[PDB]
Design an enzyme around this catalytic site. Sequence first.
Site, PDB file in Angstrom:
ATOM      1  N   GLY A  19       2.027   2.240  -3.292  1.00 11.35           N
ATOM      2  CA  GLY A  19       2.043   2.549  -4.701  1.00 11.35           C
ATOM      3  C   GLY A  19       2.888   1.633  -5.555  1.00 11.35           C
ATOM      4  O   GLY A  19       3.411   2.083  -6.580  1.00 11.35           O
TER       5      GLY A  19
ATOM      6  N   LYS B 194       0.818  -1.218   0.000  1.00 11.37           N
ATOM      7  CA  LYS B 194       0.000   0.000   0.000  1.00 11.37           C
ATOM      8  C   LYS B 194       0.852   1.268   0.000  1.00 11.37           C
ATOM      9  O   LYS B 194       0.526   2.258   0.657  1.00 11.37           O
ATOM     10  CB  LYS B 194      -0.994   0.003   1.163  1.00 11.37           C
ATOM     11  CG  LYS B 194      -1.839  -1.259   1.244  1.00 11.37           C
ATOM     12  CD  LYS B 194      -2.521  -1.586  -0.080  1.00 11.37           C
ATOM     13  CE  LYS B 194      -3.596  -0.577  -0.433  1.00 11.37           C
ATOM     14  NZ  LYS B 194      -4.148  -0.833  -1.788  1.00 11.37           N
TER      15      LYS B 194
ATOM     16  N   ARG C 131      -7.878   3.587  -3.643  1.00  9.12           N
ATOM     17  CA  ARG C 131      -9.233   3.523  -3.121  1.00  9.12           C
ATOM     18  C   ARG C 131      -9.670   4.873  -2.560  1.00  9.12           C
ATOM     19  O   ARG C 131      -8.896   5.830  -2.477  1.00  9.12           O
ATOM     20  CB  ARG C 131      -9.337   2.464  -2.028  1.00  9.12           C
ATOM     21  CG  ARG C 131      -9.065   1.051  -2.479  1.00  9.12           C
ATOM     22  CD  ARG C 131      -9.200   0.100  -1.306  1.00  9.12           C
ATOM     23  NE  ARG C 131      -9.353  -1.283  -1.733  1.00  9.12           N
ATOM     24  CZ  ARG C 131      -8.344  -2.110  -1.959  1.00  9.12           C
ATOM     25  NH1 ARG C 131      -7.089  -1.716  -1.830  1.00  9.12           N
ATOM     26  NH2 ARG C 131      -8.600  -3.359  -2.336  1.00  9.12           N
TER      27      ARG C 131
HETATM   28  N1  A3P Z   1      -1.291   6.015 -10.286  1.00  2.41           N
HETATM   29  C1  A3P Z   1      -1.760   5.419  -9.185  1.00  2.41           C
HETATM   30  N2  A3P Z   1      -2.830   4.602  -9.303  1.00  2.41           N
HETATM   31  C2  A3P Z   1      -3.304   4.001  -8.209  1.00  2.41           C
HETATM   32  N3  A3P Z   1      -2.861   4.085  -6.953  1.00  2.41           N
HETATM   33  C3  A3P Z   1      -1.805   4.901  -6.862  1.00  2.41           C
HETATM   34  C4  A3P Z   1      -1.202   5.590  -7.903  1.00  2.41           C
HETATM   35  N4  A3P Z   1      -0.130   6.338  -7.443  1.00  2.41           N
HETATM   36  C5  A3P Z   1      -0.107   6.088  -6.157  1.00  2.41           C
HETATM   37  N5  A3P Z   1      -1.093   5.235  -5.733  1.00  2.41           N
HETATM   38  C6  A3P Z   1      -1.302   4.775  -4.361  1.00  2.41           C
HETATM   39  O1  A3P Z   1      -1.029   3.400  -4.307  1.00  2.41           O
HETATM   40  C7  A3P Z   1      -1.649   2.908  -3.110  1.00  2.41           C
HETATM   41  C8  A3P Z   1      -1.717   1.406  -3.170  1.00  2.41           C
HETATM   42  O2  A3P Z   1      -0.368   0.935  -3.133  1.00  2.41           O
HETATM   43  P1  A3P Z   1      -0.332  -0.534  -3.781  1.00  2.41           P
HETATM   44  O3  A3P Z   1      -0.572  -0.401  -5.363  1.00  2.41           O
HETATM   45  O4  A3P Z   1       1.103  -1.206  -3.509  1.00  2.41           O
HETATM   46  O5  A3P Z   1      -1.391  -1.373  -3.185  1.00  2.41           O
HETATM   47  C9  A3P Z   1      -2.986   3.644  -3.083  1.00  2.41           C
HETATM   48  O6  A3P Z   1      -3.379   3.896  -1.707  1.00  2.41           O
HETATM   49  P2  A3P Z   1      -4.954   3.598  -1.600  1.00  2.41           P
HETATM   50  O7  A3P Z   1      -5.308   2.480  -2.499  1.00  2.41           O
HETATM   51  O8  A3P Z   1      -5.321   3.194  -0.089  1.00  2.41           O
HETATM   52  O9  A3P Z   1      -5.779   4.916  -2.015  1.00  2.41           O
HETATM   53  C10 A3P Z   1      -2.721   4.972  -3.804  1.00  2.41           C
HETATM   54  O10 A3P Z   1      -2.752   6.059  -2.886  1.00  2.41           O
END
Ligand code: A3P
Length: 754
Positions: free
Chosen positions: A488, A486, A707
């Site tokens: 990114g 989580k 999310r």
């Molecule tokens: N281009 C992008 N698309 C989607 N999520 C992104 C992003 N850039 C950063 N993120 C972040 O990536 C997080 C998830 O990390 P991961 O992909 O390892 O699961 C997300 O936190 P949230 O999903 O809680 O909003 C979001 O804030």
Amino acid sequence: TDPLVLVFVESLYSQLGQEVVAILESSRFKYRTEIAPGKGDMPTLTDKGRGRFALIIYENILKYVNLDAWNRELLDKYCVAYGVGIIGFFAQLKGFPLFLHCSINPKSPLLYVTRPSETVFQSNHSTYEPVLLAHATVVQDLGLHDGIQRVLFGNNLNFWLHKLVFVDAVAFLTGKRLSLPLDRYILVDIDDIFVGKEGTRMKVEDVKALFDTQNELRAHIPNFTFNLGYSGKFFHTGTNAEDAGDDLLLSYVKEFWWFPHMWSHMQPHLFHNQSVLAEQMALNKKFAVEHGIPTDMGYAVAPHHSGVYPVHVQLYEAWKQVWSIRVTSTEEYPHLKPARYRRGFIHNGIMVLPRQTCGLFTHTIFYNEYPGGSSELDKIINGGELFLTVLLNPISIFMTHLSNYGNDRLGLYTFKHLVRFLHSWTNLRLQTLPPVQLAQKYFQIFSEEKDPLWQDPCEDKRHKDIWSKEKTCDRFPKLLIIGPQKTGTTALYLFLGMHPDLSSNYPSSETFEEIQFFNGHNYHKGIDWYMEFFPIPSNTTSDFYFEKSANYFDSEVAPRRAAALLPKAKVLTILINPADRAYSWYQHQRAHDDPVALKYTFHEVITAGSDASSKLRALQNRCLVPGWYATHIERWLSAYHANQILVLDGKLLRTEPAKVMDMVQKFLGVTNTIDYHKTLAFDPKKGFWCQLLEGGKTKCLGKSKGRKYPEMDLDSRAFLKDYYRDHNIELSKLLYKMGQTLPTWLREDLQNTR
Ligand SMILES: Nc1ncnc2c1ncn2[C@@H]1O[C@H](COP(=O)(O)O)[C@@H](OP(=O)(O)O)[C@H]1O
Ligand SMILES: [Ca+2]
Ligand SMILES: [Ca+2]
């Protein structure tokens, strides 16, 4: 105190210091090599109220005698308050009533292994008791003048008895904490039985000598039985005197032990089909059953150790199918040289043991046919490689071949004089166990070696020669995205595969892009399972491969495993604010219908007391401990160099990923540098950055990534502010030490602390 051995040596390449380190490594004695302070700096000795070293060794004791007064008093206070002895190595000595200028004292309290049946330090005081007499080359101080016992050696560890005295001094000065039981276990494996064209085979006199030597050595070592490596094809192929001599060995079928060891002595790694390999072993089994040879010992040896390390899965499966093999042995794990580093492992239901050599090889037929001369065999027996292997290792498997029991029968003579030497000079209880019992004793003594440490076969010429030719070499990634979760990582993973020079692995059936090889039971599946996710390198393709697994970050076994298989890989860990990372990972578990995240609020999860459910503690550990960024990066710092690890700002990736990806490409050293400014377009509906496809279409991530959830309340934010405060300060010092730029949230959090 901790069982680490504090080793002071003048340089990093001195012979005496390396000999001490070799003895400690052979005995699994943990050591910390340091440069001896010539009135310089003394390292820290006590941690958390307890000492960090149970024994100190000094290869130049004049650097202890002429030590600076403050450091000397600190060392003497440490040794008195913790009972830590001093092993030294070298007119009157300064500070001691001892002058400086081969038999054994029979009543010396040093003697735990040494049997007294068969520069000096001399003066007039009762604070020392001599151990080796000449006056006294090795003296054991009683601590009646300084306070703590010390053992001072007048020479190096070149002589075999001085090594025997040294390991007694290590055992005594620690208090028999760093020692071994006197029980020793030996198993001799005779290889290549029924192998050859003309000559150097079994005659009737050779078999009778082999049987008689086993009988008389059973009086010395109780239940000592030879292990025979038969080979069914070269049966009744020698001379007329050797057709009966081979037949005489089947008369003593109830007097020896036998292991299969190939039908026609061919390397199993040449068998790319398992079924034809199994049919070979079935022919050797048919030979053994027909001739009355027992087929239930559960032990076997490959002809060139081909397919045990590196793992040829066909060899492992055919051994368990035809023979139900439980124990094998090799000399390839982790490497052939040095032999003192050889360990064992348990893989695919087969326990592998470090096979050793007694110095007798295949070409060794006569006494003068032995390479180096006949005295080199006597040197190895009488205090050489043979004696040191039995002394410093509890369990030994010795290799001997058909030619070592021929004209001169050097296999008989070598083990005859070895056992006589062991029982006349040591108090060791020599034993011989069956290979199943021998292997179980090995992995009870060494339980840390029960998990293998995989390496790349093509990094070693010896491992590449006994690897299958149908397996390509560089089918391994060069970049690891370790997480944490989580932060990114999926957006970074999805924007790396758009680069034409970079290729991503195939998704898994359940964990998708995550392989989870280095952090779980998938490491025990083998490296051939790991290579299936990465395509064949071919020629005209992108040879740069990467995979992401967010569980590699906080895992303890993953960094050392990843450094073993991929020492040249690049490590990519991205960080956001750990209060936000804990909250997002909490809300992600709520989105995956985890029932303890849905039952408890985020404040209740972080305020979880000890008197709560274990599911809540697992979730709280999952939310908070990955937020300890300084802890987990320092684990990866122990395995990878600092320049192979890049720390990104995940909030910067959230806002400006185009400059983030430029830093990634300059970190990865690509050639076709993608202009991600025109390639990435911000999506107002998504709230993040997505692809800019042709025609203005945008390709974003799924609903799982990025999310939407209600904001963190102030009480939980206040808890995560003071919880991570010392963690963020340690993280700021750590990232400053690595030379990597601090993230924007980290510098902001330090400003809020100020
Ligand atoms: N281009 C992008 N698309 C989607 N999520 C992104 C992003 N850039 C950063 N993120 C972040 O990536 C997080 C998830 O990390 P991961 O992909 O390892 O699961 C997300 O936190 P949230 O999903 O809680 O909003 C979001 O804030
Ligand atoms: Ca062989
Ligand atoms: Ca051989």
